[PDB]
Amino acid sequence: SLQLLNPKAESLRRDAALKVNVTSAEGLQSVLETNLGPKGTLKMLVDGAGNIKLTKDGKVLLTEMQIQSPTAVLIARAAAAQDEITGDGTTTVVCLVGELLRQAHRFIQEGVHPRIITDGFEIARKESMKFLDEFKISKTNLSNDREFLLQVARSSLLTKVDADLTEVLTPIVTDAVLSVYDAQADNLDLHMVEIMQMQHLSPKDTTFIKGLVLDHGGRHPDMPTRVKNAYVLILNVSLEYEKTEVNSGFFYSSADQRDKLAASERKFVDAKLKKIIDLKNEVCGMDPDKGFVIINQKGIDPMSLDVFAKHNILALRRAKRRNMERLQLVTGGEAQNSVEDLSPQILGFSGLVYQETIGEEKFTYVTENTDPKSCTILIKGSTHYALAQTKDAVRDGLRAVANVLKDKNIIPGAGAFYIALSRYLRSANMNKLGAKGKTKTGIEAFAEALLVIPKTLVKNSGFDPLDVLAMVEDELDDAQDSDETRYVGVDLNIGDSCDPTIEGIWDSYRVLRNAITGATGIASNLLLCDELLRAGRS
Amino acid sequence: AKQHENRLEDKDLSDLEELEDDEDEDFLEAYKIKRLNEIRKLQERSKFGEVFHINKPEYNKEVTLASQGKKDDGGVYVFVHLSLQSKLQSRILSHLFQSAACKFREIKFVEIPANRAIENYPESNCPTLIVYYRGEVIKNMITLLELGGNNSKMEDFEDFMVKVGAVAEGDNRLIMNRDDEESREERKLHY
Amino acid sequence: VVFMNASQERTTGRQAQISNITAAKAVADVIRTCLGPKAMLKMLLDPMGGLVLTNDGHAILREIDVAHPAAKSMLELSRTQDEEVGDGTTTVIILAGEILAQCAPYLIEKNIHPVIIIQALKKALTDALEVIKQVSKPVDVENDAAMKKLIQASIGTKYVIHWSEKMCELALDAVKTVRKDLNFEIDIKRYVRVEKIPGGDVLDSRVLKGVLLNKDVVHPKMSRHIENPRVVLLDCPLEYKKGESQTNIEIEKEEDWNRILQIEEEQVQLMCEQILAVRPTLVITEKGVSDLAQHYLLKGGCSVLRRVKKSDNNRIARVTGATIVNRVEDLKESDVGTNCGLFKVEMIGDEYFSFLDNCGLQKACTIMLRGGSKDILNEIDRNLQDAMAVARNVMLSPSLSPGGGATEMAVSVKLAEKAKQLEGIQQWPYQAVADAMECIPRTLIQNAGGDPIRLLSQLRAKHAQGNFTTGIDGDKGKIVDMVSYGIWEPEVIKQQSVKTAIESACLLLRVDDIVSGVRK
Amino acid sequence: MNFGSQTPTIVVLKEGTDASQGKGQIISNINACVAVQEALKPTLGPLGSD
Amino acid sequence: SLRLPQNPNAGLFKQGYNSYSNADGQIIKSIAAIRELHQMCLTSMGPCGRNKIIVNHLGKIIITNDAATMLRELDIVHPAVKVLVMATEQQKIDMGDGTNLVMILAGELLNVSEKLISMGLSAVEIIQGYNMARKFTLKELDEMVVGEITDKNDKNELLKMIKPVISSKKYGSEDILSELVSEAVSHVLPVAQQAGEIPYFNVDSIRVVKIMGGSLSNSTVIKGMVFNREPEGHVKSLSEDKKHKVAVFTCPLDIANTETKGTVLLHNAQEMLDFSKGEEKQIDAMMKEIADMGVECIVAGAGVGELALHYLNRYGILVLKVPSKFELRRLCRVCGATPLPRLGAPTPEELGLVETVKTMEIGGDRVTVFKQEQGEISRTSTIILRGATQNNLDDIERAIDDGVAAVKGLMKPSGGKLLPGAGATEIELISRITKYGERTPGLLQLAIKQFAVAFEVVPRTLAETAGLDVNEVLPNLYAAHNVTEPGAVKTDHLYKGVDIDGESDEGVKDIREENIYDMLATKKFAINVATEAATTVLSIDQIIMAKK
Numbered sequence A: 001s002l003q004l005l006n007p008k009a010e011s012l013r014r015d016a017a018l019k020v021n022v023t024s025a026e027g028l029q030s031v032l033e034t035n036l037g038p039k040g041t042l043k044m045l046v047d048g049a050g051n052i053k054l055t056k057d058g059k060v061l062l063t064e065m066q067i068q069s070p071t072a073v074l075i076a077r078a079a080a081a082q083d084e085i086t087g088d089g090t091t092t093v094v095c096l097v098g099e100l101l102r103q104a105h106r107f108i109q110e111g112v113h114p115r116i117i118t119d120g121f122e123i124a125r126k127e128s129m130k131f132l133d134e135f136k137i138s139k140t141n142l143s144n145d146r147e148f149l150l151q152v153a154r155s156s157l158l159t160k161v162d163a164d165l166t167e168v169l170t171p172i173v174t175d176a177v178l179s180v181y182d183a184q185a186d187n188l189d190l191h192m193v194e195i196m197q198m199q200h201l202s203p204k205d206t207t208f209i210k211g212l213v214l215d216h217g218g219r220h221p222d223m224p225t226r227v228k229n230a231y232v233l234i235l236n237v238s239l240e241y242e243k244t245e246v247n248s249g250f251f252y253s254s255a256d257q258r259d260k261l262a263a264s265e266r267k268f269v270d271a272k273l274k275k276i277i278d279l280k281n282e283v284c285g286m287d288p289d290k291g292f293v294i295i296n297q298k299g300i301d302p303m304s305l306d307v308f309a310k311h312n313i314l315a316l317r318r319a320k321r322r323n324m325e326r327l328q329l330v331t332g333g334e335a336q337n338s339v340e341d342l343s344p345q346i347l348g349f350s351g352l353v354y355q356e357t358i359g360e361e362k363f364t365y366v367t368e369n370t371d372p373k374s375c376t377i378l379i380k381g382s383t384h385y386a387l388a389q390t391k392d393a394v395r396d397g398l399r400a401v402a403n404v405l406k407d408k409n410i411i412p413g414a415g416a417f418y419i420a421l422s423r424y425l426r427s428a429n430m431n432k433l434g435a436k437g438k439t440k441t442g443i444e445a446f447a448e449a450l451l452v453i454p455k456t457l458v459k460n461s462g463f464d465p466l467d468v469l470a471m472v473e474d475e476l477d478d479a480q481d482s483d484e485t486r487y488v489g490v491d492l493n494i495g496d497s498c499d500p501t502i503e504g505i506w507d508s509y510r511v512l513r514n515a516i517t518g519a520t521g522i523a524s525n526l527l528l529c530d531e532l533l534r535a536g537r538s
Numbered sequence B: 001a002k003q004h005e006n007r008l009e010d011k012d013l014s015d016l017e018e019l020e021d022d023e024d025e026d027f028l029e030a031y032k033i034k035r036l037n038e039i040r041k042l043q044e045r046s047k048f049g050e051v052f053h054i055n056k057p058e059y060n061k062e063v064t065l066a067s068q069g070k071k072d073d074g075g076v077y078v079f080v081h082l083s084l085q086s087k088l089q090s091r092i093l094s095h096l097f098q099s100a101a102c103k104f105r106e107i108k109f110v111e112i113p114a115n116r117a118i119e120n121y122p123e124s125n126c127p128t129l130i131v132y133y134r135g136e137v138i139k140n141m142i143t144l145l146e147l148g149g150n151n152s153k154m155e156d157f158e159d160f161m162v163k164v165g166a167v168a169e170g171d172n173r174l175i176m177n178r179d180d181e182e183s184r185e186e187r188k189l190h191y
Numbered sequence C: 001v002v003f004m005n006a007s008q009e010r011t012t013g014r015q016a017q018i019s020n021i022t023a024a025k026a027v028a029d030v031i032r033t034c035l036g037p038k039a040m041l042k043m044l045l046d047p048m049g050g051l052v053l054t055n056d057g058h059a060i061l062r063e064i065d066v067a068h069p070a071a072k073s074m075l076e077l078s079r080t081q082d083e084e085v086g087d088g089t090t091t092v093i094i095l096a097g098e099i100l101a102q103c104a105p106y107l108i109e110k111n112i113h114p115v116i117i118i119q120a121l122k123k124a125l126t127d128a129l130e131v132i133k134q135v136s137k138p139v140d141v142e143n144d145a146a147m148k149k150l151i152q153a154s155i156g157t158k159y160v161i162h163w164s165e166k167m168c169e170l171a172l173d174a175v176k177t178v179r180k181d182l183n184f185e186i187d188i189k190r191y192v193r194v195e196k197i198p199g200g201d202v203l204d205s206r207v208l209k210g211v212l213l214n215k216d217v218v219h220p221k222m223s224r225h226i227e228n229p230r231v232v233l234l235d236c237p238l239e240y241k242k243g244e245s246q247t248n249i250e251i252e253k254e255e256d257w258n259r260i261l262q263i264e265e266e267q268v269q270l271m272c273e274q275i276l277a278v279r280p281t282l283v284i285t286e287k288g289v290s291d292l293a294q295h296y297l298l299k300g301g302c303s304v305l306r307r308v309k310k311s312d313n314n315r316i317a318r319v320t321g322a323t324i325v326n327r328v329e330d331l332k333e334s335d336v337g338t339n340c341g342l343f344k345v346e347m348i349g350d351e352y353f354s355f356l357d358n359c360g361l362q363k364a365c366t367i368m369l370r371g372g373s374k375d376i377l378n379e380i381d382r383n384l385q386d387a388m389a390v391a392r393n394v395m396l397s398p399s400l401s402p403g404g405g406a407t408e409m410a411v412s413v414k415l416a417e418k419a420k421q422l423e424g425i426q427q428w429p430y431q432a433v434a435d436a437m438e439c440i441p442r443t444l445i446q447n448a449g450g451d452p453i454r455l456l457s458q459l460r461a462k463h464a465q466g467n468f469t470t471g472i473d474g475d476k477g478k479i480v481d482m483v484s485y486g487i488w489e490p491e492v493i494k495q496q497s498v499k500t501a502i503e504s505a506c507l508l509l510r511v512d513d514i515v516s517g518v519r520k
Numbered sequence D: 001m002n003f004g005s006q007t008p009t010i011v012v013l014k015e016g017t018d019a020s021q022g023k024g025q026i027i028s029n030i031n032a033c034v035a036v037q038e039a040l041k042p043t044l045g046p047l048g049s050d
Numbered sequence E: 001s002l003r004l005p006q007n008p009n010a011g012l013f014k015q016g017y018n019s020y021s022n023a024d025g026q027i028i029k030s031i032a033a034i035r036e037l038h039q040m041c042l043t044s045m046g047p048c049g050r051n052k053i054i055v056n057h058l059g060k061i062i063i064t065n066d067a068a069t070m071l072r073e074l075d076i077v078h079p080a081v082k083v084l085v086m087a088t089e090q091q092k093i094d095m096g097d098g099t100n101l102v103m104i105l106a107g108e109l110l111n112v113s114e115k116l117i118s119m120g121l122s123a124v125e126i127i128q129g130y131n132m133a134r135k136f137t138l139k140e141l142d143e144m145v146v147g148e149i150t151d152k153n154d155k156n157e158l159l160k161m162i163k164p165v166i167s168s169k170k171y172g173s174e175d176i177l178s179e180l181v182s183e184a185v186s187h188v189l190p191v192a193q194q195a196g197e198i199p200y201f202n203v204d205s206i207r208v209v210k211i212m213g214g215s216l217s218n219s220t221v222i223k224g225m226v227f228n229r230e231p232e233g234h235v236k237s238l239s240e241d242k243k244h245k246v247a248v249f250t251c252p253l254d255i256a257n258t259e260t261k262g263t264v265l266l267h268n269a270q271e272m273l274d275f276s277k278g279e280e281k282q283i284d285a286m287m288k289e290i291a292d293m294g295v296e297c298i299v300a301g302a303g304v305g306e307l308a309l310h311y312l313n314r315y316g317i318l319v320l321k322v323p324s325k326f327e328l329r330r331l332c333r334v335c336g337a338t339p340l341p342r343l344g345a346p347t348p349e350e351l352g353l354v355e356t357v358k359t360m361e362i363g364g365d366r367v368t369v370f371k372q373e374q375g376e377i378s379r380t381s382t383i384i385l386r387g388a389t390q391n392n393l394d395d396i397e398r399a400i401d402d403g404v405a406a407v408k409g410l411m412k413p414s415g416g417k418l419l420p421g422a423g424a425t426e427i428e429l430i431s432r433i434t435k436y437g438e439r440t441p442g443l444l445q446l447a448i449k450q451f452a453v454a455f456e457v458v459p460r461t462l463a464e465t466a467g468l469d470v471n472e473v474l475p476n477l478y479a480a481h482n483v484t485e486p487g488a489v490k491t492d493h494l495y496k497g498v499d500i501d502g503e504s505d506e507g508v509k510d511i512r513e514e515n516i517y518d519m520l521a522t523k524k525f526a527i528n529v530a531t532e533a534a535t536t537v538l539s540i541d542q543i544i545m546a547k548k
Ligand SMILES: Nc1ncnc2c1ncn2[C@@H]1O[C@H](COP(=O)(O)OP(=O)(O)O)[C@@H](O)[C@H]1O
Pocket: A035, A036, A037, A038, A056, A057, A088, A089, A090, A091, A092, A155, A156, A158, A159, A413, A414, A415, A416, A457, A490, A491, A492, A505, A507
């Protein structure tokens, strides 16, 4: 019928559209499920320009590789919204949507309508929230213990790199959120940490710095790199004029006025710089071991560097926009644009400032702050792809530890929630059915589709999933009768059940929320889709 | 593919600031420094800006040496006008030169009487428009019947400057590309 | 010697009408399964690459380019139905197709003229509006409990029936905010804002009366939490405005160039001092802001946000009551907005969001929708447009009618009784209108999975007893009255459907020749 | 698991890059110099040719 | 997003193969595909029907009003339309009458089925509905029959038979076309009254030879046959009475050569001298036994030698060429001769009887005639059909085949069993089938109802082709049947039918005095094969094609 409207159109309806949706989901599942867990494989995103990059997150794999199929675009957009708000759990979303469409399509072939199947997923979804809010546990984060944050960070960073690099990098994640905390307002910013890309000794030789680190060096050699006590000063106006907004020109009457009109531009430079020199000696004159550094966002005149070089003034330029907020948090200063009003109160303080010449560039290091409300992480590496790999590891690990402070509740990992949720969604007696023999088909499909996560971890480790889950099933049968609450996991070293709380594996509360909510919505709408169409004007 | 290029290519230094809050700073400021350098080159090249009413001895220098410019092949276009006050098209073309001179300061606009230009020149062939570049004649244009004749407008003259390679197609100063502020205002409301 | 550059050949006679009526049937077949509560979903592949998952009729037709010109008259009916009401778009297409499909074997078989059919449809349309007026009844408009089930009627087809308890409260508070006193309900969809935020959970949502901005403050010293904010709207840029006269300055003395940049600082100084004449706390501007002007506003605590859209400034004006003033000299205490509160910037890693809340009856709000993907956010957003679209007509007119095939069946039963009573040449196409209303009940039954031949046979005998509120359930397919369940829609949707269906049939039935090749 | 029907192997060097091992290339390089040498062979001497 | 997956697992079959299921309105399209060529049949039924030009790829044109004939040349793509082609082809082969009806009825059963499938009736119940309607339809055709022939040969009775048949195909004038057939039917029939013998009739007996020129009024009925032959030796008017004799030989009139390497062999001059004269004396000696029997014309089956021809025209023996099998067999049935391949003496009992053999100019070419007389009648007569346009000769010739095919309908059944024509037989079944729907319960009643609505096409078509408004002519005719059989016997409301030309209102002045009727045997198989055409199209829910 569609060909009569547009001969150049196409349409798959009610059997070919269903196979496309399920095969595209299973095809996306079979490729991308291998990255799940610590034993997952590394992918090399080699584009046409030859750029190499190692990663295991499903967000960046699907972002660089354009998706041709229309179904997998909807799943990639779900991983984008998952990675956007949360930053973790993209591999669980594509596996749940792939398994839900697989388990649902098993029943659609048996002659069941898609409507009551999706109705069972929503009742099963709401039943999981009534199971999740009872399954979570509350802890007191006021103590600020380091042992809990390390093992929670170790659980997230083991799924990115091997063990020896995780042990070196897992203190860097815990050191990121030391001072950034507010009990009353409950405000916690993630963007204040600064990720610098640079080539140095090795990835395993990185370290945490308390204060700020800028990528700009001193232009003149005469200024001192070592400064024992520095008072920062924030500038935003450009000392070097780029252009005059109102058009004008110097028409000199004689040759004697040429150098005077050249000195007219020198007066406006000396006018705004004289207050800077007066600001230096206002604190104390002839004070050794006390420097004065200036951080400007816009450019600096090279003619003016001689003025800063004579008085031993460190000047940096072309700074970032978000760094202006980070200066006052680290050094404790105050941001200023003009130079009309100046005082020693607005100035910050720093205990140590130094520079290091690495290659054809120089990096400025500002450390030894009194009460800094921010910090930075140097991403050192032996190549170009390790920087992006460690950058994705930190950007995915910062969200896992930051959610512990946003909400005190935390779920144990190692597939404990998926295994425990399977039994609870078996038999809904008279709680929430809605109809006889209709909703229960979807309850069974949703319960069986959640257990693919612990099985996928076992497939990557190289053991049998049914054998290692049989003892997990036998363990929880006696745990209910033993009168003891016990959470079981999946250990991939020996192939035997385990205890997450004892060993140290955890998952964030918001990961499982948006993953189950996003997967159930996409799995529902794709089952409701009965026909694919295309139309347009080339 | 073009959707990513339109963010930077289709915005000047004044329009690039619109994407300061939306796009990344390093992606935007990297291109603003590039476009800022291009603006500085045009200011240094702005050696002209009014019609040079010359005379012949000088032609052998103003028209041709200029056409060499720096001789870095810094060529300079030089539009000559063999004016003839008795003709109606000549006075129209003189107005277009002064109007274009105020806008395109890098291009040299030259004018001279036609009777003083060539020995016994045909008055019927006037007004004549010659375009020099690196000493070579790029275009020996005849009377303005090609450009509408008596009904010649500023839009037709600016279009001719793009054909000879004197001004880029996507230049913001051309009236074809320089959309009115009221036009862009209606586009944003209806978007 | 062609004599015609535009289709010298012609397709005339009855074959052009077969292509017209068959094309009008084909556009209805691709959306026949898109009706009722058990309706399926569709996917469209635009050439730009932006996919969309839709079941509403208007979104299906507008994104499908059709080469057949006679079919395009059917494509635009959902566009007409959308801008007029915004609900009931699918019923107009299938109803117009059944009228054209039922009226097909009369020129072929009976050879009755089209203009006689045009007279028959108008008298049927006159009687259709008469019996719809008889079947409709009024209800109380101020009862919030009654408004929930009417909004739930259109929501039952869409995906968000599972959250119908939340969606009714989400839409009822929003439509009442923009509503005001003065066609007695002059509020417009343009004032209602709906910002789509990927991520979160759809269960967690609230109707905040404010304007949600998608940007951060320009300077880090500014406080993000204000207890008693004072909004001031501006159109002038805080930057130095460049004059359009192209003024050039002849600098001869040495102090002139320094004085110009000092006058630049003095102008921004004098300009910022006039902002502080009314001591505001929150400033909004639709243009850029220079870094020089940021420092002088720190002493006053005037939070500035830049590059705000023109429509958002109007929405900020109606909420806080501030007046948009371009120049900085005309700021008065009355110009400064008041009765604002709860200014807070919630930190989210994607983008910075700033909230607003109140304590000139025009008002506005911003519905922050949370979900799992950008495409389903458009689905829930379009359901919000359908959620308030069904609520406008019950507020405009108190009239109200049933639905679910019952109101369409009442038209067919009343027309069928008087069709035999007419006894004229126009009674043959007059019967086609009575048979054309049977597709909707039928469609609903077919999608539900029932047997339409016997379910509709007893429905004829049921309506013959003298009742009108008896419909067809969409889940199981009973002949139970809709008073128990509560399926009710406004009267304006069914009025616009029969009018647009009849008026579209009159346009397409009077075509006999097809030509092309004009290239206007 | 695989993306498509087949997967052709990668050439290590770029397509069209000439390379060779063994003693054949250094003999070809020596013969190339001798080929240039023969042009200047009869030129050497007072009785040589231009 | 930019491109679909384009139907995966499509490599199971070839790219050219396509499936067409019942969904997506494709069964409605197949009904619309029937509607394309069905409307072509609307303007070709009835006496006012319009012929059709069909230009083949070779250029051979046939202009015609008959369905079965027109559908042979058109190459069809849709398989459901080909069911109608072979259904009408079956109608032409068996009965040779009522082919438009097969097309117009079975197409309308699919038309009214478009409404039934759209309502929601299952396809299995649709076949059960028409089958139960078919058993009642064929039952009532035997009940409402009136009149019978009861005599194989009569001048006035054949006017009631042939005239309503040829009235559809090339109506023209009624008397000049009907008398050519009724005169020829009486010649070929073995009358043999008061003997108890079984009648016999062959379709291949009556055959029409096309000759250009002249006019339709100058057509005559020839007792014998005719070919466009030329006598070799001499032409003879044969004014001698005392009838001649006929001898038919299937072998050539020449020396029976040896099948295996017939070659001369002459060892000496004595055989060389006698071999030339031996062939002359041998051929002459065989003609003596043939000539003494009094034969004056011999029909040869193949090429005749010159030496044999020299002795045949010596005694004035005519020679006729018939170089084919069927052309030689048809001539023996006229004179009643038994051929023998031997070159000996024909037997006297086997010799045929032909009085005269004339050669005259009809179409400008030489033709040989074999007119018999009232005494010693013969069979397999021909009809000299004169006309101006060769295309009109083709359609009038097939009208004689339809008329000759109608004469076949009297031999097999017990009698004539004529029905009222002019839509009266169709409109009567509408009331009877409508009453049958009211007597039966169940959901099949709508199938019985729409089966009656499909029979309205015959009066609707005849009213449309006659230049009248069908909205006024059709319901005016229903008033004759809405006044159903009162208490008085001998009701004459059954003969009311449509009228092509004349009085207003249209119920025809009976089909009676008009002497137009229809055959029962045509209506039986036509409704049977038309229902099978709709059954096979409606029963199938999936169609598969290849290469297009
Ligand atoms: N060391 C571990 N042992 C067992 N299970 C683990 C371990 N680390 C992670 N997991 C499981 O892997 C799942 C996903 O974790 P992770 O790989 O960090 O996210 P993503 O799959 O998005 O990269 C979690 O639900 C968790 O149960």
